Structure formats: C-alpha cells, structure tokens
mmCIF file of C-alpha atoms in Angstrom:
data_model
loop_
_atom_site.group_PDB
_atom_site.id
_atom_site.type_symbol
_atom_site.label_atom_id
_atom_site.label_comp_id
_atom_site.label_asym_id
_atom_site.label_seq_id
_atom_site.Cartn_x
_atom_site.Cartn_y
_atom_site.Cartn_z
ATOM 1 C CA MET A 1 131.131 102.985 75.725
ATOM 2 C CA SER A 2 127.525 101.840 76.455
ATOM 3 C CA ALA A 3 125.157 98.888 75.688
ATOM 4 C CA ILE A 4 122.560 101.630 76.459
ATOM 5 C CA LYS A 5 121.748 104.017 73.604
ATOM 6 C CA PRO A 6 120.472 107.603 74.061
ATOM 7 C CA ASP A 7 117.108 106.456 72.604
ATOM 8 C CA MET A 8 115.747 103.018 73.519
ATOM 9 C CA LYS A 9 112.513 101.111 72.870
ATOM 10 C CA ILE A 10 110.350 99.535 75.604
ATOM 11 C CA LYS A 11 108.273 96.381 75.206
ATOM 12 C CA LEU A 12 106.250 95.111 78.160
ATOM 13 C CA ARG A 13 103.602 92.558 79.144
ATOM 14 C CA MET A 14 102.011 92.682 82.613
ATOM 15 C CA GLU A 15 99.813 89.848 83.996
ATOM 16 C CA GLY A 16 98.145 90.111 87.329
ATOM 17 C CA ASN A 17 95.167 89.939 89.618
ATOM 18 C CA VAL A 18 93.688 92.661 91.874
ATOM 19 C CA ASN A 19 90.975 91.633 94.349
ATOM 20 C CA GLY A 20 90.487 88.484 92.197
ATOM 21 C CA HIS A 21 90.153 90.383 88.860
ATOM 22 C CA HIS A 22 92.583 88.927 86.244
ATOM 23 C CA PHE A 23 94.175 91.064 83.549
ATOM 24 C CA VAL A 24 96.874 91.138 80.889
ATOM 25 C CA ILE A 25 98.232 94.514 79.666
ATOM 26 C CA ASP A 26 100.801 95.174 76.916
ATOM 27 C CA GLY A 27 103.072 98.186 76.581
ATOM 28 C CA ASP A 28 105.111 99.666 73.728
ATOM 29 C CA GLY A 29 107.180 102.808 74.227
ATOM 30 C CA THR A 30 110.441 104.679 73.993
ATOM 31 C CA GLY A 31 112.734 106.499 76.374
ATOM 32 C CA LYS A 32 115.926 108.502 76.848
ATOM 33 C CA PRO A 33 117.881 106.708 79.615
ATOM 34 C CA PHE A 34 120.428 109.504 80.123
ATOM 35 C CA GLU A 35 117.664 112.184 80.313
ATOM 36 C CA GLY A 36 115.536 110.131 82.787
ATOM 37 C CA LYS A 37 112.453 110.194 80.510
ATOM 38 C CA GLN A 38 110.156 107.511 79.090
ATOM 39 C CA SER A 39 106.719 107.191 77.596
ATOM 40 C CA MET A 40 104.657 104.227 76.507
ATOM 41 C CA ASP A 41 101.290 103.206 75.085
ATOM 42 C CA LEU A 42 99.537 100.621 77.240
ATOM 43 C CA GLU A 43 96.642 98.455 76.096
ATOM 44 C CA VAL A 44 94.559 96.119 78.263
ATOM 45 C CA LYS A 45 94.345 92.799 76.356
ATOM 46 C CA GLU A 46 92.342 90.641 78.834
ATOM 47 C CA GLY A 47 90.089 91.571 81.787
ATOM 48 C CA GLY A 48 88.934 95.002 80.497
ATOM 49 C CA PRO A 49 87.212 97.135 81.479
ATOM 50 C CA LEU A 50 89.340 96.928 84.644
ATOM 51 C CA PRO A 51 87.144 97.083 87.744
ATOM 52 C CA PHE A 52 89.793 99.007 89.735
ATOM 53 C CA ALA A 53 91.783 102.252 89.391
ATOM 54 C CA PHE A 54 94.379 101.933 86.567
ATOM 55 C CA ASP A 55 96.641 104.255 88.628
ATOM 56 C CA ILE A 56 97.574 101.498 91.103
ATOM 57 C CA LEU A 57 99.439 99.752 88.260
ATOM 58 C CA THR A 58 101.393 102.617 86.775
ATOM 59 C CA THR A 59 104.642 102.529 88.831
ATOM 60 C CA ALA A 60 104.929 98.826 87.767
ATOM 61 C CA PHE A 61 104.912 99.910 84.066
ATOM 62 C CA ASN A 62 112.505 100.692 85.082
ATOM 63 C CA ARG A 63 115.062 102.829 86.913
ATOM 64 C CA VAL A 64 117.403 102.696 83.865
ATOM 65 C CA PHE A 65 115.212 105.702 82.873
ATOM 66 C CA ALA A 66 116.596 108.008 85.544
ATOM 67 C CA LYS A 67 119.169 110.794 85.044
ATOM 68 C CA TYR A 68 122.208 109.890 87.218
ATOM 69 C CA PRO A 69 124.968 112.395 87.938
ATOM 70 C CA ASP A 70 128.611 111.168 87.790
ATOM 71 C CA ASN A 71 128.887 111.400 91.636
ATOM 72 C CA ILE A 72 126.243 108.599 92.184
ATOM 73 C CA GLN A 73 126.881 104.977 91.069
ATOM 74 C CA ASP A 74 124.199 104.093 88.429
ATOM 75 C CA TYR A 75 123.400 100.497 89.381
ATOM 76 C CA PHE A 76 120.711 100.253 86.668
ATOM 77 C CA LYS A 77 122.779 101.293 83.618
ATOM 78 C CA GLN A 78 125.658 99.094 84.927
ATOM 79 C CA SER A 79 123.237 96.105 85.036
ATOM 80 C CA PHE A 80 123.032 96.028 81.167
ATOM 81 C CA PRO A 81 123.225 94.228 78.928
ATOM 82 C CA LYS A 82 122.259 91.212 81.123
ATOM 83 C CA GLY A 83 119.619 93.244 83.003
ATOM 84 C CA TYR A 84 118.101 93.268 86.479
ATOM 85 C CA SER A 85 114.896 92.563 88.403
ATOM 86 C CA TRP A 86 112.854 94.336 91.018
ATOM 87 C CA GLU A 87 110.251 93.325 93.560
ATOM 88 C CA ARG A 88 107.947 95.886 95.170
ATOM 89 C CA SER A 89 105.494 95.961 98.052
ATOM 90 C CA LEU A 90 102.775 98.642 98.021
ATOM 91 C CA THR A 91 100.870 99.253 101.271
ATOM 92 C CA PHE A 92 97.848 101.597 101.125
ATOM 93 C CA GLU A 93 96.332 103.417 104.112
ATOM 94 C CA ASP A 94 92.982 101.442 103.920
ATOM 95 C CA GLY A 95 94.644 98.000 104.030
ATOM 96 C CA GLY A 96 95.058 97.407 100.311
ATOM 97 C CA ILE A 97 98.344 95.561 99.621
ATOM 98 C CA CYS A 98 100.098 94.835 96.329
ATOM 99 C CA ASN A 99 103.195 92.889 95.348
ATOM 100 C CA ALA A 100 104.748 93.486 91.918
ATOM 101 C CA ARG A 101 107.843 92.277 90.070
ATOM 102 C CA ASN A 102 109.613 93.152 86.836
ATOM 103 C CA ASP A 103 112.369 91.133 85.126
ATOM 104 C CA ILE A 104 114.097 93.493 82.690
ATOM 105 C CA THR A 105 116.355 92.359 79.837
ATOM 106 C CA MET A 106 117.746 94.109 76.778
ATOM 107 C CA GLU A 107 117.772 92.838 73.169
ATOM 108 C CA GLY A 108 119.508 95.385 70.879
ATOM 109 C CA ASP A 109 117.776 98.813 71.158
ATOM 110 C CA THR A 110 114.846 97.406 73.245
ATOM 111 C CA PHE A 111 114.178 96.845 77.004
ATOM 112 C CA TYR A 112 111.882 93.861 77.559
ATOM 113 C CA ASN A 113 109.797 93.772 80.741
ATOM 114 C CA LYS A 114 108.101 90.755 82.310
ATOM 115 C CA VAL A 115 105.748 92.383 84.866
ATOM 116 C CA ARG A 116 103.528 90.730 87.490
ATOM 117 C CA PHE A 117 101.139 92.635 89.719
ATOM 118 C CA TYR A 118 99.035 91.133 92.540
ATOM 119 C CA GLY A 119 96.764 93.098 94.816
ATOM 120 C CA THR A 120 94.362 92.126 97.564
ATOM 121 C CA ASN A 121 92.417 93.416 100.563
ATOM 122 C CA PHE A 122 91.203 96.581 98.834
ATOM 123 C CA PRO A 123 87.899 97.572 100.415
ATOM 124 C CA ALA A 124 85.035 97.297 97.918
ATOM 125 C CA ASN A 125 83.956 100.877 98.832
ATOM 126 C CA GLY A 126 87.493 102.315 98.672
ATOM 127 C CA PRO A 127 88.906 104.651 96.000
ATOM 128 C CA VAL A 128 90.759 101.814 94.168
ATOM 129 C CA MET A 129 87.729 99.573 93.664
ATOM 130 C CA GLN A 130 85.402 102.616 93.103
ATOM 131 C CA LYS A 131 87.844 104.208 90.547
ATOM 132 C CA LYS A 132 88.158 107.558 92.396
ATOM 133 C CA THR A 133 91.893 108.164 91.845
ATOM 134 C CA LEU A 134 93.237 111.083 89.796
ATOM 135 C CA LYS A 135 97.063 110.702 89.805
ATOM 136 C CA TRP A 136 100.153 109.894 91.815
ATOM 137 C CA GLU A 137 101.801 112.918 93.326
ATOM 138 C CA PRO A 138 105.463 113.576 92.412
ATOM 139 C CA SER A 139 107.666 111.620 94.858
ATOM 140 C CA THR A 140 111.198 111.064 96.126
ATOM 141 C CA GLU A 141 112.557 107.492 96.307
ATOM 142 C CA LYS A 142 115.133 106.976 99.099
ATOM 143 C CA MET A 143 117.780 104.502 97.882
ATOM 144 C CA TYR A 144 120.003 102.631 100.365
ATOM 145 C CA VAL A 145 121.419 99.167 100.988
ATOM 146 C CA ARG A 146 119.619 96.807 103.423
ATOM 147 C CA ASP A 147 121.060 93.289 104.105
ATOM 148 C CA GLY A 148 123.268 93.555 100.920
ATOM 149 C CA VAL A 149 120.318 94.482 98.622
ATOM 150 C CA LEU A 150 119.683 97.852 96.950
ATOM 151 C CA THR A 151 116.354 99.092 98.414
ATOM 152 C CA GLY A 152 114.189 102.087 97.476
ATOM 153 C CA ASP A 153 111.499 103.462 99.770
ATOM 154 C CA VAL A 154 108.715 105.858 98.741
ATOM 155 C CA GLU A 155 106.129 107.496 100.980
ATOM 156 C CA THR A 156 103.615 108.951 98.551
ATOM 157 C CA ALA A 157 99.922 109.354 97.804
ATOM 158 C CA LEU A 158 97.279 109.234 95.104
ATOM 159 C CA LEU A 159 95.210 112.380 94.686
ATOM 160 C CA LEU A 160 91.508 111.459 94.778
ATOM 161 C CA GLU A 161 88.399 113.240 93.661
ATOM 162 C CA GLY A 162 87.265 115.656 96.431
ATOM 163 C CA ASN A 163 90.541 117.350 97.557
ATOM 164 C CA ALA A 164 91.623 114.118 99.385
ATOM 165 C CA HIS A 165 94.795 112.020 99.250
ATOM 166 C CA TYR A 166 95.181 108.260 99.583
ATOM 167 C CA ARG A 167 98.548 107.336 101.143
ATOM 168 C CA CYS A 168 100.762 104.506 99.899
ATOM 169 C CA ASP A 169 104.177 103.377 101.082
ATOM 170 C CA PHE A 170 106.401 101.548 98.507
ATOM 171 C CA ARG A 171 109.517 99.368 99.136
ATOM 172 C CA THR A 172 111.365 98.064 96.088
ATOM 173 C CA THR A 173 114.355 95.720 96.081
ATOM 174 C CA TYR A 174 116.568 95.772 92.990
ATOM 175 C CA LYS A 175 119.003 92.991 91.891
ATOM 176 C CA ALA A 176 121.384 92.909 88.893
ATOM 177 C CA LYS A 177 121.429 89.565 87.031
ATOM 178 C CA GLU A 178 125.260 89.718 86.662
ATOM 179 C CA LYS A 179 127.095 88.775 89.901
ATOM 180 C CA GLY A 180 129.497 91.612 90.858
ATOM 181 C CA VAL A 181 127.606 94.836 89.910
ATOM 182 C CA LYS A 182 128.677 97.140 92.748
ATOM 183 C CA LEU A 183 125.958 98.584 94.966
ATOM 184 C CA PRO A 184 125.637 102.382 94.945
ATOM 185 C CA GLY A 185 125.842 104.688 97.926
ATOM 186 C CA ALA A 186 122.566 105.979 99.364
ATOM 187 C CA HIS A 187 120.859 108.674 97.263
ATOM 188 C CA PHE A 188 117.463 110.013 96.136
ATOM 189 C CA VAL A 189 115.518 109.597 92.903
ATOM 190 C CA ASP A 190 112.849 112.244 92.270
ATOM 191 C CA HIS A 191 109.974 110.820 90.187
ATOM 192 C CA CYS A 192 106.922 112.189 88.419
ATOM 193 C CA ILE A 193 104.610 109.720 86.682
ATOM 194 C CA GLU A 194 101.676 110.962 84.568
ATOM 195 C CA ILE A 195 98.871 109.501 82.469
ATOM 196 C CA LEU A 196 99.105 111.801 79.386
ATOM 197 C CA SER A 197 95.956 110.398 77.700
ATOM 198 C CA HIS A 198 93.432 107.568 78.062
ATOM 199 C CA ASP A 199 90.271 106.087 76.531
ATOM 200 C CA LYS A 200 86.887 105.738 78.334
ATOM 201 C CA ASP A 201 87.663 102.759 80.604
ATOM 202 C CA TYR A 202 91.488 103.076 80.592
ATOM 203 C CA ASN A 203 91.750 100.144 78.159
ATOM 204 C CA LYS A 204 94.310 102.405 76.350
ATOM 205 C CA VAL A 205 96.670 104.670 78.345
ATOM 206 C CA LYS A 206 99.700 106.773 77.404
ATOM 207 C CA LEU A 207 102.060 106.902 80.413
ATOM 208 C CA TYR A 208 105.051 109.163 80.995
ATOM 209 C CA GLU A 209 107.715 109.258 83.730
ATOM 210 C CA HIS A 210 110.577 111.688 84.450
ATOM 211 C CA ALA A 211 113.169 110.632 87.072
ATOM 212 C CA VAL A 212 116.367 112.354 88.331
ATOM 213 C CA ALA A 213 118.867 110.957 90.877
ATOM 214 C CA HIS A 214 120.378 113.445 93.350
ATOM 215 C CA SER A 215 122.074 113.712 96.772
ATOM 216 C CA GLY A 216 119.614 116.237 98.389
ATOM 217 C CA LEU A 217 121.574 119.408 97.368
ATOM 218 C CA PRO A 218 121.150 122.173 94.703
#
C-alpha cells in the first residue's frame, strides 16, 4: 500500500546563519504521518548559545506529517519514497527576512532532512535578537498552485513578552523529486507548533507539531 508507515523516525541536520551568527543543529524524532503529528529532540551542536530567538527556526524543523482527508490530494505522501524539497521565505514586520530550505528523503522507516536557514536584517534591538519571543500562534497554511508549483502561504505571528505579537508572513514552495506527482487542488493546512521543553539557552529543545488538511468546512 504505502512506503510510509504509521510510525516513522525523523533525522535532521540544520546549518545556517542569522545576522552573521553561524550554527549547526541536529534533530532526532518520530511521527505519525497519517495522524499529522510529530515530535523531535533538537540539539545545537555549533554556535550555542544562540544569540537569537530559537523560535524563528522551528517551522524549518515536513508536510508528510499532516492528516489529509481522502477528498484532498496528498502531494507529500505521494512524493515518497523518492522525497521532495521545499523553499521558504519568512518576512517579519520589522524588516527581518529569512530564507530556508529542506531536502527530504526516506531510507526505510526514517525521513532524512537536509535543512538550511539564513536570516538577515533583524534589528539588534528587536524581539528576535533580544530573545523576547514566546511561541508561534496556531496558523492556517493556504495551499494553491502558482506558475505550476505547489505554494503555501501563512500569515501568522510570534507571541512576545508583554501582550504583543510580532507578525510574519511565510511563502513555501514544494517540489516532488519524482517527475509526474500530480499537484493537489487548493486547500488549507491547520498547524500548531510547540516547544514542549527546553534547557537554559535552548541548546536542547523538544519540538512538537500537529497539522490537519481541510477544505474550510466542518
């Protein structure tokens, strides 16, 4: 039936640079692709303690972990075993900009993730470089096709200390490695990403995400 098992492993390395600060971060986790649920342990291996809010990274740490109903084409599960890639722009309300990419493959029971994350133009006094973020709010990703490429848009925000939000707009493009994987119709994916636990300087983080695809109806 499926290259994708009900329980899968996740292995990840991210390398990147934010405002000139270099880092390498590993991840090891598990998830339930058909339930839309994943968790992982992250550990900063180089560049810790990170001089910027860990939260900006967390959506870069795989839409295979989204619960798809039968009446929406599941591009991500159909991309396996060969896998798929994504590229994402993040634009923050104070001029901070990030570009991230993940190349996702599958070896047996495990998704492998080659993640890159680059950010620049964050103000030194802003909540990212001052580490004032608390969490991402739950969000809805709008999926559609633009110029033949599956595209997801998110308009979201980070909650900050002090009853304030910090707006970010995401655009992600998604591409199957196999030629011929059919594009889906437009739809939504509801997301909620959470840091479940952390150590003092976020050198160790446990991250969870729940995602469900839907058409806007009950």
